[PDB]
Amino acid sequence: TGKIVQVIGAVVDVEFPQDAVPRVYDALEVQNGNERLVLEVQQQLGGGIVRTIAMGSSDGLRRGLDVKDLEHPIEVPVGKATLGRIMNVLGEPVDMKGEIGEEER
Amino acid sequence: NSTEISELIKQRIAQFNVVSEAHNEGTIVSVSDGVIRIHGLADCMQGEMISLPGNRYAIALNLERDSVGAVVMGPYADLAEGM
Amino acid sequence: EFITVARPYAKAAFDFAVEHQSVERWQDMLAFAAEVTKNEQMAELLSGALAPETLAESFIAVAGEQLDENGQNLIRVMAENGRLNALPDVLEQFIHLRAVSEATAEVDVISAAALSEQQLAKISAAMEKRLSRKVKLNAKIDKSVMAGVIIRAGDMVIDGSVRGRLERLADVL
């Protein structure tokens, strides 16, 4: 839906149609090479531009990549299911065990 | 040529259905860290309260040219361009 | 004021117009754009935070009398940079650049009353010797001069008015 137009280190600028600009804490997704990178939008500039922080390594990002608008903030598993386990900042499991069995995020 | 080109321009601009902002209204064009920039709002006064969608308000502090800079008096992360 | 932002665009437009032998058409194209920049409604649009691409398209539409090379490219490049309000100056610089290559000077003359067309032709031929250009005089009838004439040739000026000599005498005292 949108496209990268700048990459300054950890921050990324993304351009969207003005009728579809994301809100100010939504998550976005980019295919960085072969991996999947999540951006969290921090600011809405004019013209439909949006400034985001990359929840991952920023190297390898070209400007002009397509980005996908997830219409919800970052969400993490929660509750009993998450007790004896190690988790990423994105709520992903980081120990080598299987997926987390949460019912709620 | 001056008068005919000028009135041609008025004709063509009106023909492309552009409409100017009403005084006493504006549109949000930027949102960040609690400060919003508003385009329009020609009759804003320094320190005046302006009403946002919902029942929220902002204080117009910067009456620049081409923009008003205002501070949101509450949770701001719901605001967006074009409101 | 944006002389400094208009210099590159004027130089590029002119240096392109001589590669395609159409300086005379480019001048009037830029003059049309400079006039559209002034309208009260268009000046409202140019201030708003539209996307550069759609704001450029909303400007192409009001001017169809433009080349593919000229409008649909120059206006878009200026829109990407947000420079469209500079158009009234990009025109003047362009004119100036032309007058330089064509070895011309727009000498201005000021007088209390009309000159005899022998005085004025002598002025033309004499300035063309003072300078090294074809001059193009234009006169002004300013009464405060009272007698004599002011010749302005850019930043150079020659003052022969009786008021100038009077107020110089007033400071000789």
The CATH number given to whatever domain includes residue B58 is: 2.40.30.20
Alpha helix segments (H runs only) across A3-87: none
φ/ψ bin of B47: left (φ > 0), alpha (ψ from -120 to 50), beta (otherwise)? left
Distance between CA atoms of C14 and C98, rounded to whole angstroms?
Answer: 7
What kind of fold does domain A1-73 have according to CATH? Thrombin, subunit H (2.40.10)
Q: Is C51 on the interface with A (CB under 8 A)?
A: yes
For residue B43, give its domain range.
Answer: 1-83
User: Which residues of A fall within a CB distance of 8 Å from B76?
Assistant: 24
How does DSSP assign C95-160, residue by residue?
HHHHHHHTTEE--EEEESS---SSHHHHHHHHHHHHSSSEE--EEEE-GGG-SSEEEE-SS-EEE-
Q: With an 8 Å Cβ cutoff, are A46 and B81 in contact?
A: yes
Exposure string over C34-50, b if 16+ CB within 10 A, otherwise e: bbbbebebbeebbebbb
CA angle B52, B55, B27 (to 5 degrees): 10
**CA proximity to A22, closest of C53, B77, B37, C49:** B77
Q: How was this structure determined?
A: cryo-EM
- What CATH number has the domain spanning C3-101? 1.10.520.20
Mutate to test the interface with B, among A15, A23, A24, A49 (most CBs of B within 10 A): A24
Q: With an 8 Å Cβ cutoff, are A48 and B81 in contact?
A: yes
Q: Is A42 helix (H, G, I), strand (E, B) or coil?
A: strand
Distances (CA, A) of C162 to B13, C40, C148: 51, 44, 6
Dihedral angle over CA of A12, A17, A19, A24, nearest 10: 0
Question: Looking up tokens 């009272």, which residue turns up?
Answer: C146
Resolution in Å, one decimal place: 3.1
Q: With an 8 Å Cβ cutoff, are B30 and A21 in contact?
A: no
Q: Is A11 helix (H, G, I), strand (E, B) or coil?
A: strand
Tally of CA atoms within 13 A in the half-sphere of A17 that contains its CB: 5
What is the number of structural domains in chain B?
A: 1
